UniProtKB/Swiss-Prot annotation:
GO terms assigned for molecular function: indole-3-glycerol-phosphate synthase activity; phosphoribosylanthranilate isomerase activity
Lineage: Archaea, Thermoproteota, Thermoprotei, Sulfolobales, Sulfolobaceae
Disulfide cross-links: none
Highest taxon, organism lineage: Archaea
InterPro entries membership: Aldolase_TIM, Indole-3-glycerol_P_synth, Indole-3-glycerol_P_synth_dom, Indole-3-GlycerolPSynthase_CS, RibuloseP-bd_barrel
Gene label: trpC
Protein's UniProt name: Indole-3-glycerol phosphate synthase
Amino acid sequence: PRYLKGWLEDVVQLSLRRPSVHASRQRPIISLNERILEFNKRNITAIIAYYLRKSPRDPIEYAKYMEPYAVGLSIKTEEKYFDGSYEMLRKIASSVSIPILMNDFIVKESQIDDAYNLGADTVLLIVEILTERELESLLEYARGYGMEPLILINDENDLDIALRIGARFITIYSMNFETGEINKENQRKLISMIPSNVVKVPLLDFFEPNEIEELRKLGVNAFMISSSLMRNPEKIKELIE
């Protein structure tokens, strides 16, 4: 990975030393990008429900609530800052039958092995914390499992590296990791720069209906929604309806 500052460097250090799990996988991969494409074809609004426990609700109950509606779940497995775990990942992936994104700070191959062995269907990769060669190598490694990883971009330089290595599945955070805040203006700009054959997923804390169709008409394939659904989980039924 690169050398970073602040909590993010602590997390990268922690991730580098994270022990690998001895679990072996319990069910097939349920492809997240492919299910999004299927939902697009069928005109079903595609929502990744984003859970996390803490940042710099019961996770199983959340996952079961969202299962009938979400295109996938994002499950945070970073431990120190987000209070995530591998065991919770495992127990969600064994409890619901929709795709699971392992949302973490992946800086080595064994973390992708951990994702596969725990039941996750794909992993997050973050351009900002990796070199281009690392990103490419981790991209190919994930694809070895049948996982198209979800590539996180925060700015146009991140986008350009993602496209340079051939990414096919991108999440647009447009986030300053120092503040945890999303630049929604930049997000719209970046979405408008991504080629049509890349599955594109903005992260939204809140939405309004106007905003959802304006983004759909920019070609967005799915929406990953955090705060609104933690507050009001029932909103995902409205989104599907």
